[PDB]
Amino acid sequence: AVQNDEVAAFCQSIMKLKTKFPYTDHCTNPGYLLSPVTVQRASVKVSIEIEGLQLPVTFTCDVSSTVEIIIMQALCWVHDDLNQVDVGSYILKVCGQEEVLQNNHCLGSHEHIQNCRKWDTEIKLQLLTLSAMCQNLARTAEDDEAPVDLNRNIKEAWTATEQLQFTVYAAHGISSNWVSNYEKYYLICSLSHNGKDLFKPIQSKKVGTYKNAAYLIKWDELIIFPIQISQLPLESVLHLTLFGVLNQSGPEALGKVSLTLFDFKRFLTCGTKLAYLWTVMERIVLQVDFPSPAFDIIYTSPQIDRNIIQDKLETLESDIKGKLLDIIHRDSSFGLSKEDKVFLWENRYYCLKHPNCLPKILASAPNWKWANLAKTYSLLHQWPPLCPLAALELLDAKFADQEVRSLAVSWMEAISDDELADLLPQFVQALKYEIYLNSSLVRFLLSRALGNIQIAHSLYWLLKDALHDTHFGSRYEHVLGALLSVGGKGLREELSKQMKLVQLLGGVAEKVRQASGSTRQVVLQKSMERVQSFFLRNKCRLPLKPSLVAKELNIKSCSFFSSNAMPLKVTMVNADPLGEEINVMFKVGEDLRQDMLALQMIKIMDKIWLKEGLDLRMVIFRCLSTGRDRGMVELVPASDTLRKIQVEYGVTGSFKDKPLAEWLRKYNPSEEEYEKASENFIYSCAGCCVATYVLGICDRHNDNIMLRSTGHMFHIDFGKFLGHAAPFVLTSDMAYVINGGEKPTIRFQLFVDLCCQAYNLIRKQTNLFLNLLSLMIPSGLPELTSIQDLKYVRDALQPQTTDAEATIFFTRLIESSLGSIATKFNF
Ligand SMILES: CS(=O)(=O)Nc1cccc(-c2csc(NC(=O)CSc3nc4nccnc4c(=O)n3CCc3ccccc3)n2)c1
Numbered sequence: 037a038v039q040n041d042e043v044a045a046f047c048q049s050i051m052k053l054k055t056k057f058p059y060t061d062h063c064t065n066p067g068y069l070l071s072p073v074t075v076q077r078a079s080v081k082v083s084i085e086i087e088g089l090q091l092p093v094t095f096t097c098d099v100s101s102t103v104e105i106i107i108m109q110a111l112c113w114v115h116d117d118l119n120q121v122d123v124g125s126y127i128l129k130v131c132g133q134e135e136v137l138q139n140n141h142c143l144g145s146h147e148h149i150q151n152c153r154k155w156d157t158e159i160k161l162q163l164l165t166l167s168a169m170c171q172n173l174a175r176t177a178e179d180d181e182a183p184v185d186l187n188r189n190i191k192e193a194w195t196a197t198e199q200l201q202f203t204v205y206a207a208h209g210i211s212s213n214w215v216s217n218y219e220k221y222y223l224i225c226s227l228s229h230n231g232k233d234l235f236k237p238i239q240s241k242k243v244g245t246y247k248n249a250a251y252l253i254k255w256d257e258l259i260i261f262p263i264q265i266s267q268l269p270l271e272s273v274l275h276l277t278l279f280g281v282l283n284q285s286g287p288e289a290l291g292k293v294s295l296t297l298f299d300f301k302r303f304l305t306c307g308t309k310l311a312y313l314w315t316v317m318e319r320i321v322l323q324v325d326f327p328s329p330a331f332d333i334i335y336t337s338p339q340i341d342r343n344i345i346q347d348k349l350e351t352l353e354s355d356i357k358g359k360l361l362d363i364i365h366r367d368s369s370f371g372l373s374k375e376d377k378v379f380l381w382e383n384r385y386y387c388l389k390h391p392n393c394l395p396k397i398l399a400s401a402p403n404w405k406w407a408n409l410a411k412t413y414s415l416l417h418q419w420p421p422l423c424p425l426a427a428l429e430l431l432d433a434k435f436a437d438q439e440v441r442s443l444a445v446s447w448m449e450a451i452s453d454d455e456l457a458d459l460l461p462q463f464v465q466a467l468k469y470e471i472y473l474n475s476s477l478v479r480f481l482l483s484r485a486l487g488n489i490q491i492a493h494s495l496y497w498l499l500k501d502a503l504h505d506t507h508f509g510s511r512y513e514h515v516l517g518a519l520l521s522v523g524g525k526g527l528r529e530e531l532s533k534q535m536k537l538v539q540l541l542g543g544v545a546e547k548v549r550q551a552s553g554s555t556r557q558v559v560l561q562k563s564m565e566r567v568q569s570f571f572l573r574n575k576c577r578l579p580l581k582p583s584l585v586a587k588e589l590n591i592k593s594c595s596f597f598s599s600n601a602m603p604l605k606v607t608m609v610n611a612d613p614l615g616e617e618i619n620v621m622f623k624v625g626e627d628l629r630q631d632m633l634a635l636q637m638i639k640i641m642d643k644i645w646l647k648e649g650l651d652l653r654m655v656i657f658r659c660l661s662t663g664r665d666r667g668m669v670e671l672v673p674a675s676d677t678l679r680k681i682q683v684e685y686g687v688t689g690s691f692k693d694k695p696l697a698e699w700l701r702k703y704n705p706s707e708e709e710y711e712k713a714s715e716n717f718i719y720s721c722a723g724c725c726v727a728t729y730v731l732g733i734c735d736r737h738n739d740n741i742m743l744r745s746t747g748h749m750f751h752i753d754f755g756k757f758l759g760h761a762a763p764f765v766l767t768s769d770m771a772y773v774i775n776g777g778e779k780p781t782i783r784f785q786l787f788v789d790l791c792c793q794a795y796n797l798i799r800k801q802t803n804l805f806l807n808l809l810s811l812m813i814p815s816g817l818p819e820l821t822s823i824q825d826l827k828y829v830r831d832a833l834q835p836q837t838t839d840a841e842a843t844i845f846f847t848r849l850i851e852s853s854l855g856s857i858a859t860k861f862n863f
Contacts (some may be wrong), residue, residue: 038299043514045300046474047184050518053479054184057486059175062166064487067174067526070585071135072147072490077649080149082159084110084543085131085614087168092160099144099153103128103137104615110163127169131160132615134170135583150646154653155639155746156712162614171528173489179524186517189331193304194406196265196333200227200297202242205308205323207278211315214290215250225259227274227297229348230404231433231469234272235261242281265304269404270335271436271471272297276322278313291315292507293322296471304333314506337439338406341414345385356383364390364453367802367835369399369429370826374562376400384415392426394419396436399559416443424451428459429807431466431477433814440533441469445476453488458639460491461632464498464812467515468508478515487517492523494580496531497660500595501629505816533576534715538622538662540567541606543581544622545666549602556596564594575611580668582660584618587613593617601626605671614774621669628661628669630817634754635659638727638806641798645723648797651721652790653716655742655750674703674745679738682769693772696743700773703745716747718783721774722790724749728850730832731799734759758809758819758828762853771857780861788850799842802833 039562057064080099081579085092093113097106107126111118128137130148204223211679220242227234238259246254274295279287291313297305304354306329311322351357360383363376377400380387384397401412416439416730422430429435456463463481470477485492499516503509520528544563570576571588578584586608593607601623608618635657642654655675661667676699685695697714704713728736728751742750775781798805806826813820834842851863 038301040304042300042473043186046514046518049474049479053486054180054522055176057180059177059180064151066136066489067171068169069135069489069493070453070814071133071137073138073141073145073452074147074150074456074643074646076142076145076150076646078144080153080159082106082142082143082161084113084128085112085160086114087164089114091376095168097143099149100142102139103141103146104139106143107139107163125165126163127166127168128161128163129169130583131162132610132612133581133583134577134585134612136169137161139432151656152746155744160614164795173523173524173530174526179526182521184427184518184521186521187513187572191329191331191333191577193333193335194338196304198327198329198333199262199264200268201258201327202274202305203258203262203325204255204276205325206246206252206256207313208321208323209251209318210245210253210320211249211318211546214280217246217283218284218287220244221253221278221280221290223255224275224277224279226277226510227261227272228275229269229272230436231615235263237275242853262402265333266406267752268297269406269436270298270302270337273471274324276311276324278320278322280473290841291320294507295324298335300472300474302335303578304335304704306332312510314509317506338410338413341410343414343535344418345414346388349763350388351622354476357386360386363396363795364393367397367799367833368806368830369396369803370806370823370830372396372400386844388418388420391422395426395429395435396424398430398440401852404437413439416440421450422447424448424455425804425807428462428811429803430468431463432807432810433469436469438469438472438475442476448480453491455643456484457488457490457494458636458643459808460494461498461636462808464495464502465811465814467502468505468814473511473514478518482515482518482522485559486522489527490582492519492527493520493531497579497662501661501663515784530577530582533574533763534579534582536570537567537572537576538579538666539841540570541604541622541668542624542662542666545602545604545622548604549624561591564589564591571608576670578618579606580620580660580670581664584615586618587611590617593619597621603669619671619673621671622666623669624732627665627817628659628667629815630819631669631754631756632659632661633812633817633820634731634733634751634757637731637805638751640804641727641730641794644797644801644804645794650794650797651719652794653719653748654723655720655744655748657750672742672744672750675742675750677739678741678743681743682738693768693778696769696773699743700745700747704747704840708777711776713745713747714776714783717743717770717773718749718787719751719790720750721766721770722787722794724751725766725791725850725853726794726798726846727751728764729846730795730829732758732760732763732828732832734763736764756819757817758825760828762855763849764853765855766853767852768857780839784861788834791850792846795846796839796842799833799835799839802830804833805833806830 059065078099079096081094082097083092083094093110107128108118108123111121137146221811222242223240224237226237240257243253243255246252258826276293278290280290281287293311293313295311308323308325313320313322363380364387380397380400387393387397424447425445427444430440453686467478481495485495499512502512547563548556548560568589575585575587578586588609590607590609595605597603603621603623606620606622610617639656642656645652655672657670657672659669681699682695685698700713701710704710735756738752740753742752772778774783774787776783809826809829834845850856
C-alpha cells in the first residue's frame, strides 16, 4: 500500500526524466548505434563508398585526424570545391554495420579502426547523409507523449525512544514436500546498515505448522532489538532468514526477506507488512506486525553545518604528514588497520588536496550515528569532485548512506558513454544497495540509456539476467519495465525479435544435444528451419553486436562444434550487401556470466595499457548470456587451439620447438609476414601472461589457449577464475617463436620488458580492479563470493612494493614458467 505509492512516484519521476529527452533532439535520439571510441595515447588506408561512384575511393588518412576532416577529405575526392554540399548532413558508417563514426573523435580512437589495424583488415566505410542512415530505432512523438507504466501527529525519529520491536506472526503457503521434509522452522532476524550487522541476530523459537493448517507456520512471537528508533540510520534493513530443521529420515536456509525500517518518504514502518520469499518459483507470505501508534514517526536529517573548513593549518611535519601521505598513496582501503583508520579520520580536513581518497576516509568513520552525520555531510559538500572510477567504490554495499551515494552519482556524470558501456554490469549489481526504487543511480542509468542506444541495449540484457536472482527479482522487474517503457516502440520491437531469436537458438541447441550420434546434423537442419521461418517474416539485429542485421540463415555454413557443450556455429547473411556474413556460437548449458567477467577484466587491462600508450595487440571478443546457462559468443576467425597445432605438427616431424612456428609460417610465408606475426605473438603472449597471473586463471592447458593465424594469442575457456594453489607456462615452441630461434635473442628481452611494464600499469590501478570485482560479488558467480576472494587478486598485484621490485618479482615468474629450458636463458 506504500509499495504502490513508491512505484507511482517512480513513474512520476520517470515521466519528468523523459521531458529532458524530446524525440526531436538528434544528439540524444539519433536512431542509430554510435561506433565506440576508446581514447588512444602514423597512418592507414581507408576505403569509402560514395553514392554515384562505381568504385569506392581508397586513400591514406592520418589516424590522428578527426572523422569530421576525414568526411570531407572524401568530399574533396569527388568535389573540386565543396561550398555546394552541406558537410553537416554527411556521416560515416562502417560497411555492413548500422553504426556511425563519431565526428569530433580521432579515426585512430574507434574500436572498429583499432581492430582492423590489429588484424591488418581493410577499413571499409560508407559516405552517406543522416536522411539515408537507418533510424528504425529512433523514439517518436507518440513515445514521448505516451505515459510511463511498468512491466496526523508527526514525531521526529531522533526524539523517538520506543525500542525497535515487531512480532513475526506467520508464513503462509508452504508446499507439501516441506510438510514431509521438516518438523519445525525458525526465523533468524538480522538488523544491518552499510551492509554490516548493527547487532547480533535474534533467532525466533522453533515452531511447526499450525493445527489443521499444513500451509501455515504461526510463531506469534514478539522480537525486541537492543536499539531505539533514534539510533536507526535511515537505510536500516531487516533480514528474516527462514530455516527448517530436517525430520529424522543442520537446518537449511529456506529463504531470506528484506524490509526497510523506513519507506521512500522517510516514515518508519508501522502496522502489518507482508513479504514474499520465493522457493521452483512458489510464493510464501511472511507477516511481520510493527507497532501502530496514533502517530507517524518520520526520519528527519540533522541540521546542516555551513562551516567551511582551509587557509591556516597545523602543517605538522613529524612524519605524521608523511604517514598521512603514505596511507593517501596506499593502493586501496582493503587491509587498512583500525589504527590507520582513526589517524586518517582526524587529519581528514588535510586530505582535501587528494579527492580520490574520500573512500578511505568514509570507511575509517567511527560510526553513522545521527549526531555525527552533520560533520560528515559538511565535509562531503566542500569535498572536490572525484574521478568517476574512484567514485564507483561509493556505490558498493559498504556505503548505504543516501547522500554519499547520490553525490557519488553526481561525480559520475563526468564519464563518457563509451567507458560506462563496459562498466554496466557493475552498475546493475550496485542497484541491490539502493533500498528505494527511485534513486540517483537508476535515474543516471535510465538517462544514459535514453541518450545512447548501446547503453540501453546492454542494460536490457543485464537487467533480464538479474531478474533470475530470487531476492531482487521484483526490484529488477520495475527497472526493466521503466527502461523498456522509456526506450520507445522502435527500440522494444527490435528487442522482442532479439529475444525471439535467442529462444529459438536455445531450442535448437537443446535438441542437437538430445540427438545422439548420426542424424544430429539432420536434427540441426530440421530444428533450424523454424529460424529460417523466423527470418522469412523479420530482419533481426544480432544480440551480441546489434549493429549487424541478419536477414537470413545460411544453413550449409550452419554447424555444431564437437564438445560436451556441443555449441552451434550459427552463420547468417548480412542485410547490407556491403557487409561480410555473420558468425556466432550459441552455447547452452554453461553459465556464461563468469566467462563474461574474465573478458571484461581483460578488456579493462587492455584499456589501461592503451591509456599509457602500451599496445599488447590483445584479442578482445564478446560474450552475452541470453538467459540462464545459455548465450551467444563471438567467434575469432582463422584461429585454432594450441593442442590442435601440436597434433597437426606431430603427424609430420617430432621437433617440440617447431609446431607453433610452422603453423605461423604456413599462414605467413614471407619472412616479413612471419616476423610481423611472431611479433604479434610476443606482444599478445605478454598481455596473456600478465592477465593469467592477476586474475588467477591457473587452468591454462593446450585447449584453453587459442592462437589467431595473424600471430595473436588469447584464452577461451575461463573455467578456473581467481584460482588458488608457475601460474602461466611458456612451452619451448612458444619460446622458439619469441626468440625466432632455439637460442635467446633481444626479442626475449622485449617480451620480459613488455610483461613487467604492463604489470606495473595494472598495479597502478589496483583499486579499480578490486572495486570492479567486489561489485560482482552479489551476482553469485561460484568463485567470487567473499571479500577474501578479492585479497588473492590484491596479493597477486603486490601493491606495497616499488615498480623496481615488482619487475624482479614478475621476471622470476617468467623464469619459473619456462620450467627446465629456463637454464638456456640469463636472469
Ligand atoms: C570477415 S568474415 O565474417 O567472413 N570471417 C569470420 C567472422 C566471424 C567469425 C568467423 C568464424 C567462423 S568459425 C570461427 N572459429 C575458428 O576458426 C576457431 S574454433 C573457436 N574459436 C573461438 N573464438 C572465440 C571464442 N571462442 C572460440 C571457440 O570456442 N572455438 C572453438 C574451440 C574448439 C576447438 C576444437 C573443438 C571444439 C571447440 N570463426 C569468421
